[PDB]
Design a protein around this ligand. Structure first.
Ligand SMILES: [Mn+2]
Ligand SMILES: [Mn+2]
Ligand SMILES: [Mn+2]
Ligand SMILES: [Mn+2]
Ligand SMILES: [Mn+2]
Ligand SMILES: [Mn+2]
Lengths: 313, 313, 313
């Protein structure tokens, strides 16, 4: 498992601004140093310098469309080059809008990618169904093919090309879904495991089916888009859209340890960590701490232990 | 799902007095407004004016027997009229003693009702087995038929008529059961899932069996008597008899979402919420918040999402 | 279930010193009084007077080897006499080093004993693999037979005789295992259920397999070595080596209730409770409280209730 770290300090996908410090604070926790403490080749591509777009009025309801649209365009080319250097792209960003650029760039080199989206939300609103206008809640809407012809021409997204069908993706962790989003869900037949299915089936079976549904037919590259608000806020409090009744720390770790085990992880997003939203210095370290553990799990660290191919006795 | 809200500000089923404010504080959280935000017809029958009975000395050990007995008599007729108006009675009360009046009134119109009792306690003490004398811990004892001839003549309960057998009921959440209560349990063969069975089987299977045991033979109206102390106190702290090792928020939501799905919910009690018992303004809002979510789940709100029968695209 | 309480106020198995107060503070919680409130014969053998060994320099990296070694030798003879008086030895100690003396003494009278080790760690480091030198993280290494000839001659342990194979033991709760320890695990084929297997299988199945793997062939005496850091620190915070992502309070209770039910419990250790490590008086009572509940579960207290062989009606 060879990683390719990409800093994406972007926040215009939503209101609150501290999420652009994510790349920074995660790096201080020692992520790159801990990844190396393992069995991976870590190559830091730094923090993408996101240019400022002054003139960016809302498109109807959409907010900062040219800023978000250009930030993904920028990140898409980055994830593409990294995948071209044969590396698991790691997008440490701000808000989830960037997911558009990640899934896009990742797919350019791997059209047969599968997407597991751990989130408390489906983030599948269209520019025409969103009531918030916040784009970090619409990324999935720009990526799905069935939804082609439903997504209007929004300034800053003409470079977009829906790279995934409604079947190449599974949601895990849902607990705050809008009416229109739920309609798309059922209507497009998108496979998902909300907190209800997790409660009923157990995180064990949940992951069995998820990986079975994406890798059943054949094996394919996998993209994990992890929104920290997927886990219960008692675990990741410093995030913009917390919702109670979330995935436990343990469950969070189980999902990724299982993903790692497929040996099919290709792309990973760790999003929505916003330090300035912590009510205490501890809630910050706690949110960051859990973000880093989730990541290490993605690249090898196992709870039962780890050991090199040598004789320890 | 058509509801019939009934305010039952009663506290004499136990010592602590703030539980009579339950109806009030739940209403401020916006319950009636949120129920309407859904797919239900909400008709508020207000807060039952519970008359004061000055002369009500204890019956041996039983405390405030004429006060509790009359409060249930009063509520029974209320739940009966509502069920007669074809509505799911919602009893927002104080202590669990009132359950006597709810199960009674509910049954008058539906003798074939099934009872699911989510509680950390069995509340099945008799006036002769209770060591506390608190009636909010004896309600089940007055309702069971097998226990006919075991329950002495207590002032204020001559109007009582045991409306349910030991089989028409299932306990979920048990973790603090008295010796005598456990004897009745095993002796009368009452079906239950304590925190041990929940741990072993999973809340998924637990609900599968519970609904299977009550609806196996045939379908019948269902009465959910929900004591908030059923959930772990980290979720509903403002309550009189907290016991650690309880049902999670998630599990609490799973139970009701499943109950709603039967389309057989007929009666619902949300009990033991006592604001004055919160050690902080937050523990109050947290207990109320969770009480309201539990209720909405009972009438439709699903974690995977909700949407009207229309085309959202 | 007849118990034999043994106080083991020892802390030299690790750095922090407040763990030797464990015996004391657990006794104040009323353990002996609560055990009696049940169906057991409680005989207190008091707090072993652990003699002070001034001259005890480290052995290479091993720390306080003669102090730890002599404390186990002392406790081994104690657990042996108690088992000889036909009683379930209860070792309320400090650090986990003492486990060496408990498993040893216990086995002297029962060579066919089975060991269930609830811990966040495997505590199977050798004096040659440990990087901390702390012996409370090496106890298992002195007890296993396969590891005979791998454990150097350490001052204070010449009295040791490996009493268990790699198969007579099951680990439950693992989440912080060293490289060398993981090598021994896989290499010696030790059966274990880390937090990953618990997440995947459920504590129900976990206990099914554990007891099945130790009692499959035939029934045998069982030794439960319970390290409080096995449970999530939100449950047992006052302990020296906390690790997040642990066993819940509920799971902690399920493990022991199931163990009790085998009727095969013979030896029990309740370790690593360190009051002085609590950041608040509440974290102390919370850690102690949970330690006592875990113990009562081991001797009978059930969450569904308990009752004598009499007619309560
Ligand atoms: Mn998101
Ligand atoms: Mn989210
Ligand atoms: Mn109750
Ligand atoms: Mn209760
Ligand atoms: Mn240990
Ligand atoms: Mn440990």
């Amino acid at each position: 498992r060879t990683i390719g770290i990409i800093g994406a300090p972007f926040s215009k996908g939503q209101p609150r601004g501290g999420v652009e410090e994510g790349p920074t604070v995660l790096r201080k926790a020692g992520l790159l140093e801990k990844l190396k403490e393992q069995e991976c080749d870590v190559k830091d591509y730094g923090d993408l310098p996101f240019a400022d777009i002054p003139n960016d009025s809302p498109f109807q309801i959409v907010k900062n469309p040219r800023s978000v649209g250009k930030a993904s365009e920028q990140l898409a080319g980055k994830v593409a080059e990294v995948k071209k250097n044969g590396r698991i792209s790691l997008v440490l960003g701000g808000d989830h809008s960037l997911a558009i650029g990640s899934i896009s760039g990742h797919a350019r080199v791997h059209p047969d990618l599968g997407v597991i989206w751990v989130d408390a939300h489906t983030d599948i609103n269209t520019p025409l169904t969103t009531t918030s206008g916040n784009l970090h809640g619409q990324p999935v809407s720009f990526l799905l093919k069935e939804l082609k012809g439903k997504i209007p021409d929004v300034p800053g997204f003409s470079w977009v090309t829906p790279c995934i069908s409604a079947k190449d993706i599974v949601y895990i962790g849902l607990r705050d879904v809008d009416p229109g989003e739920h309609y798309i869900l059922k209507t497009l037949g998108i496979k998902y495991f909300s907190m209800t299915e997790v409660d009923r089936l157990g995180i064990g079976k949940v992951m069995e089916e998820t990986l079975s549904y994406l890798l059943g037919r054949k094996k394919r590259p996998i993209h994990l888009s992890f929104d920290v608000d997927g886990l219960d806020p008692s675990f990741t409090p410093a995030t913009g859209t917390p919702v109670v009744g979330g995935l436990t720390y343990r469950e969070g770790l189980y999902i990724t340890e299982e993903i790692y085990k497929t040996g099919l992880l290709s792309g990973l997003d760790i999003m929505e960590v916003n330090p300035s939203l912590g009510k205490t210095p501890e809630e910050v370290t706690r949110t960051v701490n859990t973000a880093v553990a989730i990541t290490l799990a993605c690249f090898g660290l196992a709870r039962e232990g780890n050991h090199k191919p040598i004789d320890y006795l």
